[model samples]
Target chain A: NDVAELKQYVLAHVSAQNASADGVLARIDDDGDGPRSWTTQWIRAGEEREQAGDLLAATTFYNLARFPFVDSPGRAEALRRCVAVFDRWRRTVPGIERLELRLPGGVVRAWAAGLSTTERRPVLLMTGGIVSIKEQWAPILPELARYGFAAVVTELPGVGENELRYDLDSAALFGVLLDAVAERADTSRAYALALSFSGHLALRAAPSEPRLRGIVTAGAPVAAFFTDKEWQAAVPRVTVDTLARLTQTTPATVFDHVRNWALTPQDLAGVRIPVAYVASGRDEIIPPADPALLRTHVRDFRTITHDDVHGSPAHFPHTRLWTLAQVLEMSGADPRHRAAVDGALAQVE
Target chain B: NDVAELKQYVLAHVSAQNASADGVLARIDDDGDGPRSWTTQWIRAGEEREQAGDLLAATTFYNLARFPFVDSPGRAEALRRCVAVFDRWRRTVPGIERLELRLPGGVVRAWAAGLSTTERRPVLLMTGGIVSIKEQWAPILPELARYGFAAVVTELPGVGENELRYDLDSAALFGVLLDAVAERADTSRAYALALSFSGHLALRAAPSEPRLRGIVTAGAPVAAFFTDKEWQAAVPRVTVDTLARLTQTTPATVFDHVRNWALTPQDLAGVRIPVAYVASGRDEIIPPADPALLRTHVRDFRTITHDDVHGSPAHFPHTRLWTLAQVLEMSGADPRHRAAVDGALAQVE
Candidate 1:
């Protein structure tokens, strides 16, 4: 039963770090067990797919090679391959735009799709999980756009070129970006769709930042995570390690920051804007207790669930659409959720 | 801002249960103090989106109109409109396949997309959450195929038309389907990507079902749910109640069944195949304790995480790819994860 799942997982993780793959009867080169080999393999695999005429497949495989551990190999192969695959994906998809987000110290590189230059569409301010860059959302950007949310995906601070630390009081980081996004004519109304740990950052700003029409969270940690006794006891060391790497801090330092990382019911109750959540009932890292606490605090936190593993992959398609609709209605673009009129019809077999 | 979130939530539930629309909206819906004109407003709204050539919006809106518990009003206008909208969506998107599995008694309706008919692929067997249907996986199918697994989205027993209970002994149900999937010409290998509580079912079968190549779970409870004193004390009544409805029993009855639901370490030790997990740190339904316990039990499971909420939605894009990759490698497809050979280059920027 050996399959493609492992290498792709390795490629994604190893590449996620390299900021960067292969096949062949041809004898390969890069041979270490670390992320470097994972990167080159994906580069080669992606190239193999590219040659097979599956542009989308080739694009992802190539993109996986570009995964950096901080950055890719000095050889620049992953970077070069990234451009080639990006060209194919963009050319085939026909709507990706480059973004230079203005942050506190410097700008961050990002990508946007679905909005025209002058159209004032409602924007979904999306960011990534632990090891992902803004590029991770490429596959779903089209669907989000078709549903009316001009998807503006970012690498966020601390990720990619932007050097923002995910520490003590970084919640304001999102507000700054949201402010910049709302000011743009292309998106007069913006909604925050924070992923994973970014949910922690988003919710912190949620109560104070009124500019956001609404906020939706997917697999977000909205609590003082390190405080979970059972989690610490069993095997959450993976997260402990990843955070240490992502923040370039010692484990003790990460723990020190985590001590003050609680998002209380008080914080959630104060949020005047709408909040929605998508959950996987089988998520290994999270317990049902997290969102349950959120439901207890937030006045009306809407949620959708799938039995999908870890990331709720199976739960994604419809829930993503559902959340996008909720945001559009909340942001006053279509306050009544006119699209929902036919929502019942979706139930018909 | 008092949003339409609550009603939208109720609408989704009612619609998910009844399996149909418009006539149900005529019952005048969840009778809320908010959104006085929600029903009629969305009707006109979807029409506008329709006339404006946004059929996607129209479909969702029209579908919302049909939301009711059990059944719609006197008519099935929303049902008919759904077909129209579905047609539009189908026509616009290339590559979608319909699936129907003949079980022991009745049949199941399903959908699949990604890869080609001639391509004998390792199939990712996908199902949904408590309330979702097969259509939920449409958008993600392409990404899965691109990553290498041909996806087969199903309306598993108890989900769509198959009429099975998610209860004390439904583990064999998944095994039956896995056996069936093996016979399909398009697939030679299989992975059980059970979501939410279904992870219970999958794990129950994993050790016994030699047909299963590997297993992946999201938000799965690897221990006794009701047995957790802290979990019970904090809040798990909602789950107790939902399971009651799903299994056609009362809370007491469900609890009677739940007593036997724990997946002990010894239980996990029986499986011969590889298992991977994706987790949400803030999962409301699953406690971090669930995966925590599994970590103790399962000797060598791989995992990925996102600061995502309860169910790991943020973990989807990259982690899903990662999980799929692991399954491929585990199931004997490039078992060495040969694609990961050049692990050194992964450090490249």
Candidate 2:
């Protein structure tokens, strides 16, 4: 199955603490490895890691806990855990700094870091989504340190420390977050990355933010999201509910609000920067058409569809790490992260 | 909030059995009452009813068993229960007839009924969905009988009895199923009712099948299903998996193959029937854009988007019944089922 609930569970850092694929599989056996069974095991695993004072591992566990329960009611609680565990994990990342952006609804917490060398290099500003948090960048953002850049991770807004709406109006938040990036360090050249649905935010942000040199998104809706026929067929109920919470809209108007945020060709044309996209060939959510439509409108565009679901290369980290590395290079990462992309880029080509 | 898992569990004739409002909310407490917990309760409830020889009640429970579990891995087992209980229920509905259409792949199952006065009456052919088996028409199909019509419900193909592939190519199956329907009764004037994603199928079928005088879709994806961008973002993983299983393809290739089936403006231009759509303003799957898009292409079109999640009115029986009735009229029901329509129509208006 492309959507094995435990695939990411095993790949997540919390897997080190749980240590038993068999136990996880056993719970799944009781209910088939959908979100429900995964939920049963991962929450307990997260709690166990939390008690051990390993909030880093606990964040991974807690984030994984939201997959099956990915909607209102339970989803709210799952995100709450992601928020709490991430708070602890962020404090532990040595050399990293944090800042809070005060907005209409609440504070937007932002984080940044530099590698061995830092001389006002290019700045990579990124956002995490659904189950992913800013702290999750431990595996990737740190690589920016090597790529002549410092990376800052705040959020796509809502759910983490940002309780404000993540609707079309929040595009200003991206600008402010980026302005903070400039003040903290030298980001003469800058780019943006949006993971999962937050890719919509990045797309919306690209048109208005002139400092951006490049952009990339995975598992995002660009065109068909606004079309009536495709939107009805593809989006799941749980996903809609989750968006409602993230946007803080009444459940009744989430789709209406979301549909309103769709990308027009005008928005795409406004983004003069080169854009690269990493995608899953069988993305469970965002349809493949999204990337194809994007290919049409961008000034400069590149897309690669991975062999996993939702454009995620589920933890054979080498593959997607390569994909992301290439995305970085396209955004003009000077002498891009070459250690892995050399091999992966050839595969993509 | 609208993907209420327990909603269907209780609605599947269980409403007549459990008889409560607040009690249902409790069952949704921890796990949010999807297939896992609902299965635990409904199966036992079904067993109790079956012991009392109440196959009808058992059928409802058995069908509801699939609620929380919507797709493959466990979905097959849940659908098996629905099939088994429905077989028992079919015998209970007098005047309802069953038949099979043998194709190279397998047998397609069908059920039909009339409203007492039956002699070569117009046939209303329907495709089953959301566990709405052919047998479930006992409460509704016979109503068409009063409309100077006989109704036929057939295997949707790729699931239940027709366990064949359901892809864009499967649009051909509609011709075969309708041919079988016409042979079974007087279908001089006929219409198609596609539920959920099958609206895409029905849309495909409508353009080609000359026998269809009217076409209606309830929560189906028509316009943007195929393109890479829309499909990847909108469709759920379980839906894709179920599609892969039914279509007899790997999950990896489902979209690639299905994308071949998208409707062009030409296809819609060919559909000259009075097309009426029953939609929810807040449909979780099918968007208002779907129907809105359909209106642009079809020669004759009327659409309704009920204001609820996924644009569905949920189970306000009279409301949807009215919607269905109006659809029949649009599809050339020929003065058939007018009494039900008149009353339900009043409710809907």
- Output DockQ, candidate 1: 0.03
Residue runs of model 1 more than 4 Å from their true location after superposition: A1-36, A51-53, A66-80, A91-95, A102-104, A114-118, A179-183, A186-188, A233-238, A251-253, A332-345, B1-349
Model 2, span A222-335: residue lDDT tens: 767656655455655555655777777765687667777778878888888777777777565676677887888886877766565553533233334444665566655645
Chain B TM-score in each of the candidates: 0.71, 0.80
For residues B268-307, write the lDDT of model 1, one tens digit per residue: 8876667777787756667777777777777667776666
Q: How many clashing residue pairs appear in each of the predictions shown?
A: 121, 46
Quantify all predictions' global Cα lDDT against the true fold.
0.58, 0.58
Return the TM-score for chain B, candidate 1: 0.71
lDDT at A23 for candidate 1? 29
| Position B317, candidate 1: lDDT | 40
User: Model 1 - which docking category?
Assistant: incorrect
